[PDB]
Write a protein that binds this ligand. Structure first.
Ligand SMILES: *[C@H]1O[C@H](CO)[C@@H](O)[C@H](O)[C@H]1O
Length: 478
C-alpha cells in the first residue's frame, strides 16, 4: 500500500504537539502564568478535574521524544513556543531562559535530522495580557503578538524555516468566546450559565478580526526584516471540518458551502481576497468588523502556505431561526445552518473516542479540492490529523497499544490525501499526525489518548509504542 513513493518527492512527514499540552514545568525557569493555567485551575472547566502542570513533561524529556521520532523516520516536528516563557508578562523583559530552552529543543531536533515547524501561538496567552486588556478582545494584542513573533524570528529564524503564526483561530473565537468551553471561557451568560462574562454574538467576531490583524502584523515584520536573509515561510493552521450537504438539494448544497465560508472563509477569504465572505457580511452585519483599506492591503497575501488541521466531516442542512434578537445572538445561528454527523438516522461513519470525531476519510480529499479551487492552489500542509483512544483504566497497557483503528484512520486519510495530490493536482507539501504522545487534551484532560505513543500516567510518564508506531516506521522507510 502506502509508501513515501505514494507522495511527491520531498513530501514532509511529521508529528505535532503544543506547549501547554506537552511541556509541564509550568513554573520553571521564569515562565509566566497563561490563560490555560488559570482555566485548568478553575472549578468546572476540565472534565476530569486535571491540569497540565506536569503534562507529559516534554520540557525535561524532549531528547527522549526526539529519539522516538527518529525511530519512526519522521522528517519534521511541529511544536509550539509558549509565549509566556519568552515574555512572562506578554511584553517587557525577555526571559533569557525561555530563549535558551527553545534553542536547545531546535538544536536537538536538527541534530537528529528532524526539521522544526514552529507554532507561535497555540492558545496559551500570557495571563498578564488577559488581565491588562482582555487579551484577544483588544486591538493592543496585534502589536504585542507582532513584537513577540519578531523576537522569535530574530532568535530562532536562522534555523527555523517554517512558521505557523496561529493555531486554529476559529476554534479559539468559538470555543473561547461563544461556547465558553475553552480559555478564557467567555460567552453570553443567557446562553450558557457557566460563563462569568461575555457576549456570544459579538466577541467571537472581534477576536477573529484581531487574530487576522495579528497574523498580518507579524507577517509584515517577517517579510520586511527577516525573510530575505532567513529564506523561510509563514502560514496559519486553520481548523477545518469538511461539510457535505444533508441532502443533494440546492438549499442544502448552499448551506454546506455557507457553513464552510463561516468556518474556513472567515479567515482565509481575508488572506486571499482582502475581505470576509459576502455571506458573513450579509448575515452578521454590524457585528462583523470592517478592514480599512490599509489593513486589507497588509492582510491580503499574508500567507505563504495554508496549514489545514482536519479530522472529520459532518452533514449540513439549511436552518431558519428568528431568535431574540440581540440577547441570544451566536455564531451558529449566524451561519443559518445546522451541522451534525447524522443523516436519516445513520452516523456518517465510525467514531473515535472524542464525541465529535467521526471517521470520514473522503472528506480529506474533498477539502483539498475545495482549498485548491477557492484559493487558486496555495501550498497546503496538513498541520494536524489523527484520532484518539479512550483512557481506559480497566484494560492492560498491552491491550491499550493495539490501536488498529488509528492505523486504519491514518491509512485511509493518507490514501485520500495521496489521491488529492496525484489525481486531483492539489499542492500538498506535508502531513503532521496528531499526536506524537498521548497528552493533555484541553477540557477533556487526560481522558483522550491521541498519541502514536502511549503515556503511562501511573508510572512516571513512561512512553510505550502503540502498534501505529511500527506502521509509520514501515511507511517512512527508505
Ligand atoms: C488539534 O486537535 C487536537 C485534538 O483535539 C488538539 O489537541 C490540538 O491542540 C489542536 O490543535
Amino acid at each position: 500500500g502506502l509508501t513515501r513513493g505514494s507522495f511527491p518527492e520531498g513530501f514532509v512527514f511529521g508529528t505535532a504537539s503544543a506547549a501547554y499540552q506537552y511541556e509541564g514545568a509550568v513554573k520553571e525557569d521564569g515562565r509566566g502564568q497563561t490563560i490555560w493555567d488559570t482555566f485548568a485551575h478553575t472549578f468546572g472547566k476540565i472534565t476530569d478535574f486535571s491540569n497540565a502542570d506536569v503534562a507529559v513533561d516534554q520540557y525535561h524529556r524532549f531528547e527522549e521524544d526526539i529519539q522516538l521520532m527518529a525511530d519512526m523516520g519522521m522528517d519534521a516536528y511541529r511544536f509550539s513556543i509558549a509565549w509566556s516563557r519568552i515574555y512572562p508578562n506578554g511584553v517587557g523583559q525577555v526571559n533569557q531562559a525561555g530563549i535558551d530552552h527553545y534553542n536547545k529543543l531546535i538544536d536537538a531536533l536538527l541534530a537528529k535530522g528532524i526539521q522544526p515547524y514552529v507554532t507561535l501561538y497555540h492558545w496559551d496567552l500570557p495571563q498578564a495580557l488577559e488581565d491588562k486588556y482582555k487579551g484577544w478582545l483588544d486591538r493592543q494584542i496585534v502589536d504585542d503578538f507582532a513584537a513577540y513573533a519578531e523576537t522569535c524570528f530574530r532568535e530562532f529564524g536562522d534555523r527555523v524555516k517554517h512558521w505557523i503564526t496561529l493555531n486554529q483561530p476559529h476554534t479559539v473565537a468559538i470555543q473561547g468566546y461563544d461556547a465558553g468551553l475553552q480559555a478564557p471561557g467567555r460567552c453570553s451568560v443567557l446562553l450558557h450559565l457557566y460563563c462569568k462574562a461575555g457576549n456570544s454574538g459579538t466577541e467571537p467576531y472581534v477576536v477573529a478580526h484581531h487574530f487576522i490583524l495579528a497574523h498580518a502584523a507579524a507577517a509584515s515584520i517577517y517579510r520586511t526584516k527577516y525573510k530575505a536573509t532567513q529564506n523561510g515561510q509563514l502560514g496559519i493552521a486553520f481548523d477545518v471540518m469538511w461539510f457535505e450537504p444533508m441532502s443533494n438539494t440546492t438549499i442544502d448544497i448552499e448551506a454546506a458551502k455557507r457553513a464552510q465560508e463561516f468556518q474556513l472563509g472567515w479567515f482565509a477569504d481575508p488572506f486571499f481576497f482582502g475581505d470576509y465572505p459576502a455571506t458573513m457580511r450579509a448575515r452578521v452585519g454590524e457585528r462583523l468588523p470592517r478592514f480599512t483599506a490599509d489593513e486589507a492591503a497588509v492582510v491580503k497575501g499574508a500567507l505563504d502556505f495554508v496549514g489545514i488541521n482536519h479530522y472529520t466531516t459532518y452533514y449540513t442542512r439549511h436552518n431558519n431561526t428568528n431568535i431574540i434578537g440581540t440577547l441570544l445572538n451566536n455564531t451558529l445561528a449566524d451561519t443559518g445552518t445546522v451541522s451534525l454527523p447524522f443523516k436519516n438516522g445513520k452516523p456518517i461513519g465510525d467514531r473515535a473516542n472524542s464525541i465529535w470525531l467521526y471517521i470520514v476519510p473522503r472528506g480529506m480529499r474533498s477539502l483539498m479540492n475545495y482549498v485548491k479551487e477557492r484559493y487558486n492552489s496555495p501550498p497546503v500542509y496538513i498541520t494536524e490529523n489523527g484520532m484518539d483512544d479512550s483512557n481506559n483504566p480497566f484494560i492492560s497497557i498491552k491491550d491499550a497499544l493495539k490501536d488498529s483503528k488509528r492505523i486504519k484512520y491514518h491509512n485511509d486519510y493518507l490514501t485520500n490525501l495521496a489521491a488529492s495530490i496525484k489525481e486531483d493536482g492539489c499542492d500538498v507539501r506535508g502531513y503532521f499526525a496528531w499526536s506524537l504522545l498521548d497528552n493533555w487534551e484541553w477540557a477533556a484532560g487526560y481522558s483522550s489518548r491521541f498519541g502514536l505513543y502511549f503515556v503511562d500516567y501511573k508510572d512516571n510518564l513512561k512512553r510505550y509504542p502503540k502498534n501505529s508506531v511500527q506502521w509509520f516506521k514501515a511507511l517512512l522507510k527508505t
